[PDB]
Amino acid sequence: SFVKDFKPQALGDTNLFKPIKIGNNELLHRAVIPPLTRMRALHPGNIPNRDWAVEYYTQRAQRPGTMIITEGAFISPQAGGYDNAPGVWSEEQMVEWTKIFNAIHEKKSFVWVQLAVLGWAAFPDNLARDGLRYDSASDNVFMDAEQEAKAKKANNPQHSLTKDEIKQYIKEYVQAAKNSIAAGADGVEIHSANGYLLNQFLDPHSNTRTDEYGGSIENRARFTLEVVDALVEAIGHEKVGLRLSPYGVFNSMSGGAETGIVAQYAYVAGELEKRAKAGKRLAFVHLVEPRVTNPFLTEGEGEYEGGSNDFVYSIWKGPVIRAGNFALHPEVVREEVKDKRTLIGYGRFFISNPDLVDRLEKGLPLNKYDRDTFYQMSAHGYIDYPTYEEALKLGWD
Ligand SMILES: Cc1cc2nc3c(=O)[nH]c(=O)nc-3n(C[C@H](O)[C@H](O)[C@H](O)COP(=O)(O)O)c2cc1C
Ligand SMILES: COC(=O)/C=C(\C#N)c1ccc(F)cc1
Ligand SMILES: [Mg+2]
Numbered sequence: 001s002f003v004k005d006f007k008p009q010a011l012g013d014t015n016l017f018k019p020i021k022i023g024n025n026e027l028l029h030r031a032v033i034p035p036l037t038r039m040r041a042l043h044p045g046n047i048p049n050r051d052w053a054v055e056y057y058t059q060r061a062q063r064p065g066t067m068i069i070t071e072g073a074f075i076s077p078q079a080g081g082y083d084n085a086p087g088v089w090s091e092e093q094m095v096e097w098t099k100i101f102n103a104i105h106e107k108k109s110f111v112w113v114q115l116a117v118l119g120w121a122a123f124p125d126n127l128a129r130d131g132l133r134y135d136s137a138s139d140n141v142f143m144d145a146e147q148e149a150k151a152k153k154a155n156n157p158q159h160s161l162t163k164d165e166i167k168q169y170i171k172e173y174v175q176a177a178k179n180s181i182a183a184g185a186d187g188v189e190i191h192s193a194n195g196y197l198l199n200q201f202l203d204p205h206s207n208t209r210t211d212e213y214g215g216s217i218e219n220r221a222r223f224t225l226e227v228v229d230a231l232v233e234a235i236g237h238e239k240v241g242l243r244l245s246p247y248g249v250f251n252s253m254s255g256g257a258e259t260g261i262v263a264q265y266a267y268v269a270g271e272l273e274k275r276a277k278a279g280k281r282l283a284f285v286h287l288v289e290p291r292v293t294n295p296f297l298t299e300g301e302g303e304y305e306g307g308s309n310d311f312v313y314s315i316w317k318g319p320v321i322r323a324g325n326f327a328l329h330p331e332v333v334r335e336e337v338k339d340k341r342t343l344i345g346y347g348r349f350f351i352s353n354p355d356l357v358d359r360l361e362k363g364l365p366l367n368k369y370d371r372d373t374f375y376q377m378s379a380h381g382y383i384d385y386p387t388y389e390e391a392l393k394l395g396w397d
């Protein structure tokens with residue numbers, strides 16, 4: 001059914017419906033599909049779902065000129081640890097990704113692969129089964145008690161990465177980016193948000209290292225910036241974006257409680273602008289808003305009111321995608337898109353509305369989402385959410 005009490009607003013008269021160029025892509029509107037893990041990939045081999053994934057992305061590519069960022073994709077087996085999330089390291093995987101990218105392009109839309117590395121968010125037992133380490137920045141602080149225990153039971157204690165192991169990850173990032181572009185993707189997004197590996201290095205709670213990769217703002221940012229630089233060299237700045245969540249607490253990141261958090265992220269933005277001014281500007285910076293500090297809490301919950309991402313705009317001068325509880329708040333979007341380099345990512349409501357862009361333009365009701373099927377091995381709650389036309393025919397009005 002449709003969301004009750006929601007009062008839609010037509011946003012067609014705003015910059016949300018003004019074209020913009022991101023990297024090589026001429027977007028026709030500024031409603032972006034942010035990365036959304038769905039767990040339909042099949043085991044073994046972390047293979048994008050052979051039955052449904054093409055259809056899922058085809059549905060959500062239906063509005064011409066839409067920018068789609070894929071679900072997170074593991075750069076290597078060591079970067080993984082969830083059996084049902086996809087990778088981008090193997091030929092078997094790329095066969096399916098190629099079909100997905102082709103389908104998106106047939107609809108005249110665009111696709112950027114998010115490159116994922118779990119660190120302490122991985123399941124230590126899956127990794128142990130596969131002969132892999134359980135990795136993070138440090139070895140004396142853990143995501144939670146349950147993960148620490150899981151790791152110990154599996155004889156796979158949380159491991160603080162050596163410099164060589166960091167270089168190996170960078171090698172894998174480079175190859176994954178190459179794989180993505182060769183298979184037809186328009187670009188890649190480096191995930192450095194939401195408490196996964198790169199975020200675990202950025203955050204002083206999770207990073208207690210005393211070498212060059214921790215112990216200061218510059219040191220904590222080192223790994224993220226090394227990945228940025230490696231990918232810019234490999235496939236070009238116009239094919240690379242970076243995702244950050246300064247105020248996120250998901251996966252045991254610090255958020256606003258850490259008084260140094262804005263400085264940490266301001267430094268990263270500054271380093272990106274420095275590179276931009278020296279001729280290598282990333283295609284975009286993607287920010288999760290303090291509106292959503294944990295994406296598994298219902299909209300309105302876990303909102304941090306003590307911080308704003310606006311600081312980034314004083315530093316980074318390129319496009320900014322902002323995501324977090326915007327679907328239910330057209331009044332907020334109307335104000336944010338007055339800034340002419342701002343795009344809006346819509347996550348949960350793109351899960352439930354394949355034709356979300358039409359609905360935003362025209363001020364239509366939104367399909368309610370079913371959180372139970374966010375992660376599920378099913379077509380149900382994946383490819384059977386109706387368009388507005390289909391919903392009317394089903395009598396949802
Ligand atoms: C089911 C689900 C899966 C997600 N998967 C990813 C992901 O793979 N990578 C990522 O950076 N963010 C991921 N996110 C976070 C979203 O991209 C987004 O920032 C968040 O849901 C807030 O936006 P929203 O309120 O419009 O949903 C996920 C969120 C949800 C609910
Ligand atoms: C392969 O990438 C993933 O598995 C990503 C997530 C999971 N699970 C993920 C990343 C960011 C979020 F905000 C939520 C889930
Ligand atoms: Mg778009």
Ligand code: NA
Binds near residue numbers: 375
């Ligand atoms: Na889960």
